[PDB]
Structures are given as structure tokens and as C-alpha cells.
């Protein structure tokens, strides 16, 4: 699963986590198994305007 979120919300992607994106956008099962990969994208997903 791939998407783009804010910097402060990288912690919210985890089992048993609460937040605006955690509750209303994306929810992980409490028994989740796997790995999480995230990297900054200012060079690609940032615009001066």
C-alpha cells in the first residue's frame, strides 16, 4: 500500500494508533505483521506555490 502523508503522521501508521488520518483515512489491524517503509519527498512532492 502506497500513499503520501504529512511528516508528523509517520508515527500514526502502527497497530492500535489513534489520529485523524489513523481513524478516518487509513487503519491498521491490531495483529498487523510486516514492515513499514517511509522516506521524505521534498525533491518530488514539494512546490514553492
Amino acid at each position: 500500500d502506497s500513499f503520501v502523508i504529512r511528516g508528523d503522521e509517520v508515527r500514526q501508521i502502527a497497530p492500535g494508533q489513534t489520529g485523524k488520518i489513523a481513524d478516518y483515512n487509513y487503519k491498521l489491524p491490531d495483529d498487523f505483521t510486516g514492515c513499514v517503509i517511509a522516506w521524505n519527498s521534498n525533491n518530488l512532492d514539494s512546490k514553492v506555490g
Binding site: 497497530p15 492500535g16 489513534t18 491490531d30
Partner: protein, 49 residues
């Protein structure tokens, strides 16, 4: 004082039941001795802890 033999059995049963009932009000290391308060004060990931 002739019937101590039959009184001892009743006393032992009552005292064992009383100890079992009184064992419920112990933290055992938890924050509170009532789980209703624990479930209504913390998020699940530590509520279960």
C-alpha cells in the same frame, strides 16, 4: 464448646471464601484494582498491558 469439630469446618469454609472475595481488591502491579477504570483511562495497547 462440645461442638468445636463442626464449627471448625464452617469457619474454614467461610474464611476461605472471604479471602477469595477480598483478593479482588489488589493491584498486582497494575495502576488500579478495578479494570473498568483502566479501560476508561488508557488506550488499548497499554490497557491490555
Amino acid at each position: 464448646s462440645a461442638l468445636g469439630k463442626l464449627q471448625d469446618v464452617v469457619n474454614q469454609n467461610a474464611q476461605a471464601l472471604n479471602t477469595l472475595v477480598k483478593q479482588l481488591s489488589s493491584n498486582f502491579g497494575a495502576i488500579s484494582s478495578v479494570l473498568n477504570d483502566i479501560l476508561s483511562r488508557l488506550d488499548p495497547p497499554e490497557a491490555e498491558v
